Amino acid sequence: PISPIETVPVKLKPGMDGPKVKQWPLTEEKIKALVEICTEMEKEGKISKIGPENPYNTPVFAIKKKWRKLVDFRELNKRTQDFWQLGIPHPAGLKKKKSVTVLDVGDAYFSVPLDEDFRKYTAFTIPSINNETPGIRYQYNVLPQGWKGSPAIFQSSMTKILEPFRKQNPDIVIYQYMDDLYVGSDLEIGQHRTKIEELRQHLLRWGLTTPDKKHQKEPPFLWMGYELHPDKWTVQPIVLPEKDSWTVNDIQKLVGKLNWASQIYPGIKVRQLCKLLRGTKALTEVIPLTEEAELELAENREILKEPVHGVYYDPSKDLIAEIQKQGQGQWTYQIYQEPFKNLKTGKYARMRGAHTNDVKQLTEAVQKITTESIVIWGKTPKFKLPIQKETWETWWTEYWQATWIPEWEFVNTPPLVKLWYQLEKEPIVGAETFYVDGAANRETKLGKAGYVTNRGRQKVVTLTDTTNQKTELQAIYLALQDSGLEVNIVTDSQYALGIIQAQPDQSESELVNQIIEQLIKKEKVYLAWVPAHKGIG
C-alpha cells in the first residue's frame, strides 16, 4: 500500500505548463484490458478518476510481455523541473562480506505518494471503442513509472526510512540500486538472518512490502558486466561472434568490445583490424578479413578465453600501484594489496599530441590513477614506477611546468623510462657551429632551407609545396644530419625555442620526430635561439 511519507514538493520548469498530448486510439481488446488494469490501480489508491476540469493529458498504451499498461511521459518529463546518483561503485572498492542479502522493493514506486499539487499533470485517458463518447480519466496519487522525478524522489525517501535502522545497526551495510536493496554484513549467519527480518519488518512499517522466495536474487550477482561473488569478483565472459562475413558495422562493434577489454586483458591488439575500416563506403559494406586480421582476431579469442578475477578491498592493508610502459604512449597498471591479488587493472592510451616526453606522460598516468583511487578507496596508492629517482629529479627540477608524484618507489622492471637526450646548457667548445635558416613564400609555398658553419661548410635546399615553419625545422634538420656527434646550432625559429624549453621526445609532426631522432643520435647538442631579421647571420 501507499506509505505515510512526506511528499516532495515538485514543480514544472519555470514558464512551461502541463502536457496536453492527444490520446492514441486503441482497439476493443486494448481498451478492455486497460479498463481492467486501471480499475485495479484505482481501488488500491494508486490512481484516481478526474473530471474534464483537468486540461492535461498523457497517452497510455497496452503491451503484452496477459496485458499491461504503459504511459508515455516523454512530454511531461521534458516539462518537469530538474533534480540533483549517477556515480557507480566499482567492484574493487567493496569490502568482503560474510553475507549479502538482496531485498526487492519493486512496486515501491507505487508505494511512495506524489506531490498532491503536481498530481494534476499526470492525467491520462482511457479511450472508447472508436471515436465516440468521452473516455475514462485518471491521475496518479503515487510516483509513476517512467516519470523523470520518480527515481530521485524514491531514492531520497528510501534514505530517510533507512536512517534509523542504519543508526541502530552501524555494523550493517546497505546499498540501494534501482529497486534492489543489497544488505551485507559480517554477523553470524543466524544473526544476519535475524537482522534482515527486522529490517524487512521495519520497512513493512512504511507500507513497503517484500515478495516471496520465488524471485529472490542470490550470488553471484551479474552487475554492469562484472560478476560479484562472495570471495572475489570475476569478469563476465566476453565472446567474439565467430562468423565468416564481416560488415563495416560488425567490425566497428568488434573494435569496441575489444578496446573495452584491453583494460583487463592488456595483451589485446586491434591495429590490424582497426585497418579494415580504411576507405569504407558503407556501414553495411562487406569487408574480406585480411590474413593479418584473421591472426589478430584469432589470438584475441585465446586471450579472452582466460579467466581473470580480482579481489575485494581490505582497509587494514596498504594500497600499491605499479606501472609499466607497454610501448610509446602506452601504459599498464595494476593496483593490489597482496602481490598478484589485483583489486584493479587498467591501461592508458595517448595521442602524443604536439609534443610531450615519457617522463611527462608517466606523471599523467600517475595523476589519473591517483584520482580514480581517491574516488574508489578514498586513498592514494604508494607507487612503484619504472624510473630511477635520478632521472626524475633531473627532469622535474628543471621542467618549465609545475609537476609532482605522490610517494613512490623505483621498481627495476624493464623497460625503465628515461630521458632520451638533454640539450647542453652551454655551447660546446671545439664543435662546429651551424647557423641555420629557412624561408618560405606563404602563398607560392616555394621555400629554401640551409646553413653555413664557422667551419666554412654550407648547403641550401629548395623546397616545393612547403610552409615557413617547415623550412625552419628543415634547416635545423640538415644541420643535425650533416654534423658530427657534437654540434652548436643557432636559429631564429620561434619553434626551436619551443623544443629548447620542453625538449620533447614525441611529436605529432613527422618532421619534428625526424629531428628528435637526430637529437638522440648525437652525444652533445647545444641549441641556440636569436632574434630574427636582426642582422645576426
Place this chain on the structure above:
Amino acid sequence: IETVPVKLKPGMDGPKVKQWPLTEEKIKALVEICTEMEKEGKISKIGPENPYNTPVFAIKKKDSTKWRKLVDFRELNKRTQDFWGIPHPAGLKKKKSVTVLDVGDAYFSVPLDEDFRKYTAFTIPSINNETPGIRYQYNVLPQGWKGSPAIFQSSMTKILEPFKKQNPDIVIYQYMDDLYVGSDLEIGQHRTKIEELRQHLLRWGLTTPGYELHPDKWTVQPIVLPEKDSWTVNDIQKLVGKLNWASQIYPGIKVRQLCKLLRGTKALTEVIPLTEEAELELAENREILKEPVHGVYYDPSKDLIAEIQKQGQGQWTYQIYQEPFKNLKTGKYARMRGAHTNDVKQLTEAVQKITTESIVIWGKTPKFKLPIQKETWETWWTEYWQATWIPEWEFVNTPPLVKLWYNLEKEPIVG
C-alpha cells in the same frame, strides 16, 4: 532577528558545480563538522528537489591541527547581487606591520534570507559511491560568501567603533573572513595591542583565532643585466635576445650596436671585443632599466592579473598587472623550508602569499595564470590550501622569453 533579503544578479541562476572527490580523512571530518552544525541549526538537510550545488572540502590552518570546513563559493559569489560595502584604506600598504585575523565565526550568529538558502546547497560525497551524498543547505550567513561581510557590516563597524576611536592610529580593513590590522608601532606594542582588539571581539562571541605582515619589504626590484670582462658570441646573442624582448616594456632599449658585433659566422665560444658604441648602447640600456616604466597606474575598474613562472630550484617569479607589460608589481619567491620536492606545495604557497599582498595593496584578489596542468592542480591544491578565500585562476604555457627576462631581477648583495 531581521534578515536582509539577498538576491541573485538579474538573469542569473544558482550554481550547479560538481563536488570533487575527497579522501576518507576529509570526508570523515566534514561529516563530523556538519552533524554538529545541523544540531545547532546552522545548516539543514535538503531534498533532491533542490538542483543547486557548490563544492566543499576540508583544510587545516598553519599550526592548526584541527579540520576546518571550506566551501568554494566562487561561482555563487560571481552571481550574487553587488552591494551599493566596505572601503579600502591606502594606509596599511604603508603601515610597518599588519596582522590577519579570522573573524569568520561571527557570521554564524546571523540568519540568512529563507528564499536565498537554496543556492547555498552543498554535498558531502561518499567513498566509492556506496551511499548517496549528504546534502545540506545553510540557514545562517556562510563563511566565504561575499554576501556575508556585506550584511554583517553594520554589526562589525559597531563592535569596532570603540577600539577605532581609542586608536585612530591603527588601521583596520575587512576582506572576506579576514580582518587586517595595521600599525607603525613597536612589535611588542603592536602584538599586545592586537590582543586588546582580539579579547574585545572575543567579548561578543566571535573566537578570533612569525605571522606579521610587513608592507614595505615588498619593494619592486629592478632588472640587472650581466657584466663580463670578456664577452662571447653566445653571450651577446643571449643578451640581445633578452633585450630585444624587453623593448616591449622599455622602447628606449636599443640593440643595434650589439647586433653589429654578431655579423659573421663565428664559433659560439669565440670572444669578441666590444666597440665603444656597443659599449655605450649597453650602458644606456642598463640606465633605462634602473626603474619601473613610467605612467603605470592602478585602474580600479579593471581586473588584476597575476602571472607566475617556475624558474627552477625552488624559485618562482611573478608579475601583477592589468595590461601586459605595464606591471604594478613584480617579484621572486623561494620555496618554503620543507617543500623540498613538491612543486604544487610551493606554487600553492606562492599563490596565497601573492594574493594576500593583493588584498593589502588593492583589496582585490588577482586572477591567476598558473604554470601548471589543470588536472594536476585540481587534484592536489586543497591539500596545502590554508586561506579562507579562493582566487580565480586559469592554466597557461609559460613563454620562454618571459621567464628568461624576470630571471634577471636584482637580489641583495648579501641578504
